[PDB]
Design a protein around this ligand. Structure first.
Ligand SMILES: N#CC[C@H](C1CCCC1)n1cc(-c2ncnc3[nH]ccc23)cn1
Length: 289
């Protein structure tokens, strides 16, 4: 639907490093009335990355939910080379940056509003048997002060019809400090490992993204900052096997930390569902108000 010649570059919005997202104006009438949109492209367009990007595009196109960023279309030059994904532009950036910038004015009730929206978006993914695999506040976007959306799906996979997990190992750096133990040890991804990562998201929110309190900083402190390369993963695995966990964030109530620790269960089958997480968050939020 979109022609590359009418996309005017304005700035880069994010880089995630087989791809990037740009802010552009789509101005087909060339009179500066077109709308500002978000444009995702590959940073190094190998055939493998292009096949993955096509699947990512189909996944996002199949999703319609208030808390999932909106698909708008695709753009390609040449024949079908230079594939680009066109999405709605969300003006407040990632939740990670937004939260950090406004920490003094965002209270716990608001954090739980965001939490509940994230759980509803994730439950919807689950109804389609999609596994996000990269849940983190850097992959959540803020549309306005009352609404966030899951904002990136570059690692999302569809479960096989006959299995409840998807086994995949990418080359290179993986966000290991958000990974469930079974993703670290067996490369198994499932709704339940998304629930583990959601617990880490909840942790991030209640730390208000304070620098020294990030999951990597906390876990590296727990394993020893001396550790390097491949040993980091090994020690993380052992740390999690021994029920080492991220600490309760400053100011976080016990009942919210308990949601985190229940998501961080070593037993995959005992982690809560996204519907129950949303139910519990909404009950705490009602109580607080
Ligand atoms: N979410 C998320 C992270 C994602 C980066 C991670 C991988 C490529 C870019 N990203 C998307 C954006 C963005 N910003 C503003 N409006 C948008 N709409 C669709 C994506 C998007 C900024 N960074």
């Amino acid at each position: 639907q979109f022609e590359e010649r009418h996309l005017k570059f304005l700035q880069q919005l994010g880089k995630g490093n087989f791809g990037s997202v740009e802010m552009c104006r789509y101005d087909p009438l060339q009179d500066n009335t077109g709308e500002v949109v978000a444009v995702k492209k590959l940073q190094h367009s190998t055939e493998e990355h292009l096949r993955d990007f096509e699947r990512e595009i189909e996944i996002l196109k199949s999703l319609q939910h208030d808390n999932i960023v909106k698909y708008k279309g695709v753009c390609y030059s040449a024949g079908r080379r230079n594939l680009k994904l066109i999405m709605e532009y969300l003006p407040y950036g990632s939740l990670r940056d937004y939260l950090q910038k406004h920490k003094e004015r965002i209270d716990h009730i608001k954090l739980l509003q965001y939490t509940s929206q994230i759980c509803k978006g994730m439950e919807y993914l689950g109804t389609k048997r999609y596994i996000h695999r990269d849940l983190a506040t850097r992959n959540i976007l803020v549309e306005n002060e009352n609404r966030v959306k899951i904002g990136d799906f570059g690692l999302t996979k569809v479960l096989p019809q006959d299995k409840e997990y998807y086994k995949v190992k990418e080359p290179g750096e993986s966000p290991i400090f958000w990974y469930a133990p079974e993703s670290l040890t067996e490369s198994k991804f499932s709704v339940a490992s998304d629930v583990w990562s959601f617990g880490v998201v909840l942790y991030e929110l209640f730390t208000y993204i304070e620098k020294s309190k990030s999951p990597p900083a906390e876990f590296m402190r727990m394993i020893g900052n001396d550790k390097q390369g491949q040993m980091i993963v090994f020690h993380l695995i052992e740390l999690l096997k021994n029920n080492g966990r991220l600490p309760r964030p400053d100011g976080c109530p016990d009942e919210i930390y308990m949601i985190m620790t229940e998501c961080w269960n070593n037993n995959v089958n005992q982690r809560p569902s996204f519907r129950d997480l949303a139910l519990r968050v909404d009950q705490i939020r009602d109580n607080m108000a």
